[PDB]
Amino acid sequence: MVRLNSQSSGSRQEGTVIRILERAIQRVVGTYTETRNFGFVIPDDKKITSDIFIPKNGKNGAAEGHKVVVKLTSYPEGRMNAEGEVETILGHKNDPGIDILSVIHKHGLPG
RNA sequence: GUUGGGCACUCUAAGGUGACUGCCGGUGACAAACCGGAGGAAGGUGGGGAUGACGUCAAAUCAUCAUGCCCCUUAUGACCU
Known part of the structure; x- marks a missing residue:
């Protein structure tokens, strides 16, 4: 739900998010x-826009440069980023076919 | 510590070493950089003081002192209370 601001700074009508009814994103590649x-x-x-914090026990084997799936444990709150856990390791971002595989996981396509 | 007590520690102060992105992750020209590792007392210009250029105000000082020419020169010298 968005509250409508009385004053607009441009051509379009502005608004503020007051409440979150339903959360869409539960996984993030x-x-x-x-x-x-x-x-x-x-x-x-x-x-x-914000980087997903992984706590050290959520790493699950993920090394530097590895494309990973991450399940959200928490959402962003104030200045705190979203935290998570690595659900899956895909591989390294330079390995052939991981580019597409990352797409497949991003939408949630069947394996 | 008061005393014997080597004197360890601390302090005293001479002589040294120590920080360099040096090393390691990422990042990015494969470099520089940047981001973060460690190690270390110290981390990315260690922290403070010291030491700049050519300037102009005919800026201020003849009551710091000295000073060319003036003036005072039994006083514009000097001494006391």
Whole structure:
């Protein structure tokens, strides 16, 4: 649900998200990255602007540069990013056919 | 510590070493960089003080001092209370 702002700064009508009724995204594919004490995953859907925090026990074997599926445990809240767990490792992002395989996982196509 | 007690530690202060993106992940010209690893007291210009250029104000000082020419020169010298 979106509240309608009285003033628009442009041609189109502006609005603010007041409430979330239904959550669409529950899985996110991306590229895993390893920091010192925690992971992240950079989402292939760039419409997800924020990097998904992976806690160290959610890594499940994912190395640097591996395309990974990630299940959302939490959503973003304030300035905190979304956290998750690596559900699947696809492989490395430079391996032939992982590009397409990443698509197959992004939509949730049958294996 | 008061005393014997080597003197360990601490302190004192001479002489050294120590940080360099050096090394390791990513990233990116395969480089630089950047992001984050470690190690270390210290992390990415260690932190402070010291040491700049050519400037102009005929800026200020003859009550720092000195000073060419003036003036005072039994006083514009000097001494006391």
